[PDB]
UniProtKB/Swiss-Prot annotation:
Name of the protein in its database record: Spectrin alpha chain, non-erythrocytic 1
Section of the entire sequence shown: 965 to 1025 of 2477
Function in brief: Morphologically, spectrin-like proteins appear to be related to spectrin, showing a flexible rod-like structure. They can bind actin but seem to differ in their calmodulin-binding activity. In nonerythroid tissues, spectrins, in association with some other proteins, may play an important role in membrane organization.
Every SH3 domain range: 4-62
Protein's gene: SPTAN1
The protein's assembly and partners: Like erythrocyte spectrin, the spectrin-like proteins are capable of forming dimers which can further associate to tetramers. Interacts with ACP1.
Taxonomic source organism: Gallus gallus (Chicken)
Compartment annotation: Cytoplasm, Cytoskeleton; Cytoplasm, Cell cortex
Family: Belongs to the spectrin family.
């Protein structure tokens, strides 16, 4: 983007990672948004765990 921290999203739903590139979310998680260049798949990080999640499963704090 280039990739920055600070930017945040909030998990709307539970989401258990479905491949190595992904990360697991719990409803209500505050995740650092690292890459949102893709509209559908966002690179996020929670408690140092990093991966791609469906962008439609979180809300961006903006």
């Amino acid at each position: 983007m280039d990739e920055t921290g600070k930017e945040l999203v909030l998990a709307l739903y539970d989401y258990q990672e479905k491949s190595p590139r992904e990360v697991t979310m719990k409803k209500g998680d505050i995740l650092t948004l690292l890459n949102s260049t893709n509209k559908d798949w966002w690179k996020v990080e929670v408690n140092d765990r990093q991966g791609f999640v469906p962008a439609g499963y979180v809300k961006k704090l903006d």
